[PDB]
Design a protein around this ligand. Structure first.
Ligand code: FES
Ligand code: CL
Length: 262
């Protein structure tokens, strides 16, 4: 047989026969699709499949659960009419990410009939689903969440302006006041999945002694997150599982106090 496989990404619509790989056939009819290993052992050629099915048993990199929504194009034979989305490597979810997504949606549905779509976002495990629902249905209304409710786990070792002094023959008392970017994946997938990269500010004093002991004390504050979950973002990846961008105000001050030895 020969089933039609459409690609959202390139727009193409190739007739691909059940005995041939999706990548190869696309390449034959002139469509350049991404790849690297060509041996079923990475994710360079991964696509989302949103309808139809395939035989990718020839590949191994994807977990059992990944394979429900993701295919490896360099090892995939269609078994039906397929719509897919190539170029998905940079949006793919890891197993532990998919588990959190699956569980958090289940819990979100448990409160999705009385969502305010304004004010405070509810913290924790439902936040990513709440922030995304607001993206679709909130018509750009500002939202907020206190910096102490987000669930940040921030260490000195993760703050560049502090560490550029701390890794260096620097001794004495240093006042530090600077913006830095926080990739909230450091704080675990449930914060990342709605905050992504966010600009923060730390103000405090670092003491470094000749003996190598140091201590730091100060605070952290956050600028507003710009929430955009369009089709090319990680947040959009969790969504596909149009809107309007919006701000998340993150008021308050987080306190920071640590010490160590070089
Ligand atoms: S290119 Fe490595 S899995 Fe297809
Ligand atoms: Cl600055």
């Amino acid at each position: 047989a020969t089933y039609k496989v459409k690609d959202v990404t390139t727009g193409a619509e190739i007739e691909v026969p059940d005995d041939k790989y999706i990548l190869d056939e696309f390449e034959k009819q002139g469509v350049n699709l991404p790849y690297s290993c060509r041996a079923g052992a990475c994710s360079s050629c991964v696509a989302l499949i949103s309808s139809g099915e395939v035989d990718q048993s020839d590949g191994s990199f994807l977990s059992e659960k990944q394979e429900k929504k993701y295919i490896l194009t360099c090892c995939s034979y269609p078994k039906s009419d397929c719509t897919i989305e190539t170029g998905y490597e940079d949006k793919i979810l890891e197993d532990f990410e998919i588990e959190l997504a699956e569980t958090g949606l289940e819990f979100f549905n448990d409160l999705k009939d009385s969502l305010p779509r304004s004010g405070e976002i509810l913290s924790g495990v439902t936040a990513p689903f709440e922030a995304f629902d607001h993206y679709l249905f909130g018509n750009g209304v500002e939202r907020s969440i206190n910096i102490n409710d987000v669930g940040f786990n921030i260490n000195v070792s993760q703050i560049p302006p502090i560490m550029s002094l701390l890794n260096g023959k620097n001794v004495g008392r240093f006042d530090i006041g600077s913006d830095f970017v926080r990739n909230t994946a450091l704080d675990g997938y449930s914060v990342a999945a709605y905050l992504g990269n966010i600009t923060m500010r730390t103000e405090g004093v670092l003491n470094v002694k000749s003996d190598g002991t140091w201590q730091y004390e100060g605070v952290i504050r956050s600028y507003n997150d710009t929430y955009d979950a369009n089709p090319s973002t990680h947040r959009g990846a969790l969504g596909e599982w149009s809107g309007t961008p919006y701000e998340i105000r993150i008021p308050g001050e987080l306190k920071i106090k640590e010490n160590g030895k070089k």
